[PDB]
Amino acid sequence: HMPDPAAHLPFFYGSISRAEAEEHLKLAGMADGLFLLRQCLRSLGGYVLSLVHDVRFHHFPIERQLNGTYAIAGGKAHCGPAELCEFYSRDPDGLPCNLRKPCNRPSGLEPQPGVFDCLRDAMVRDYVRQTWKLEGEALEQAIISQAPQVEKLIATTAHERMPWYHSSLTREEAERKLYSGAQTDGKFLLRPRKEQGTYALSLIYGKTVYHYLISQDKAGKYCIPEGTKFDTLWQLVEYLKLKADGLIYCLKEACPNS
Numbered sequence: 001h002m003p004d005p006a007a008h009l010p011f012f013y014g015s016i017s018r019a020e021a022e023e024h025l026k027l028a029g030m031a032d033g034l035f036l037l038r039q040c041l042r043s044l045g046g047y048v049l050s051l052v053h054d055v056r057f058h059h060f061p062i063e064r065q066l067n068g069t070y071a072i073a074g075g076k077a078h079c080g081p082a083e084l085c086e087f088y089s090r091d092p093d094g095l096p097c098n099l100r101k102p103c104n105r106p107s108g109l110e111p112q113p114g115v116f117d118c119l120r121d122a123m124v125r126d127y128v129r130q131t132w133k134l135e136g137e138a139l140e141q142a143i144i145s146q147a148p149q150v151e152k153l154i155a156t157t158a159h160e161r162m163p164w165y166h167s168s169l170t171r172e173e174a175e176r177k178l179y180s181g182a183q184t185d186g187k188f189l190l191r192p193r194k195e196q197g198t199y200a201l202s203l204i205y206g207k208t209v210y211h212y213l214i215s216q217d218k219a220g221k222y223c224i225p226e227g228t229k230f231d232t233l234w235q236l237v238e239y240l241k242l243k244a245d246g247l248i249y250c251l252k253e254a255c256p257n258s
């Protein structure tokens with residue numbers, strides 16, 4: 001069972017950072033129209049089309065629409081990632097150039113599972129079991145056939161189930177909790193602040209605790225101080241595990257709550 005419908009594509013890397021993506025493309029010798037597909041870490045169920053042209057990198061976010069299709073911003077809709085990559089191979093339709101050489105995964109390397117795989121394989125699975133009591137091949141398919149709005153809802157409160165989320169911690173209590181454990185770089189927790197609906201990332205770097213404000217837009221996207229936007233806190237954390245993006249350091253291991 002592969003929860004991501006792009007899992008069968010040889011050029012799909014799963015949940016990787018932009019740096020690793022660009023690394024794979026360089027070792028593919030660069031060249032115009034060299035491309036790969038990866039999971040989007042900001043938009044739930046989405047992808048990023050990583051392309052190179054004029055020996056410089058391009059990254060096109062692909063958003064999953066409500067009706068289950070996929071589209072680059074202002075672009076046409078496609079029923080799936082596979083369909084999407086095939087179309088753009090035969091017609092740039094806004095891209096700097098058409099997809100040519102697929103930067104396939106090197107032998108041994110599988111797609112990295114991320115939030116989306118976990119959302120479906122664990123959380124939607126349990127949601128489906130609780131509501132319909134399905135078991136075998138009926139539980140699967142049902143897992144990949146839920147509406148994007150249901151997946152979004154589960155994902156939105158998923159952080160409440162994560163060990164790094166501390167539902168009631170002051171700034172001072174967070175520091176004390178972090179200093180009183182292993183003071184390793186990237187040790188972290190997330191905590192709600194007074195103002196609805198703001199949160200704080202508390203992390204250790206150089207044996208010093210740092211606090212970062214997280215606020216959500218009027219669009220409901222969760223924003224780090226650098227301004228990068230995420231559908232969920234869960235995605236925000238998983239993203240910062242792979243890229244600092246205005247943090248003094250990446251998130252590594254959770255400071256456990258209970």
Ligand SMILES: *c1nnnn1-c1cccc(C(C)=O)c1
Binds near residue numbers: 118
């Ligand atoms: C995702 N992929 N494997 N396991 N998970 C996961 C992590 C934390 C919580 C949950 C729940 C409660 O479903 C699943």
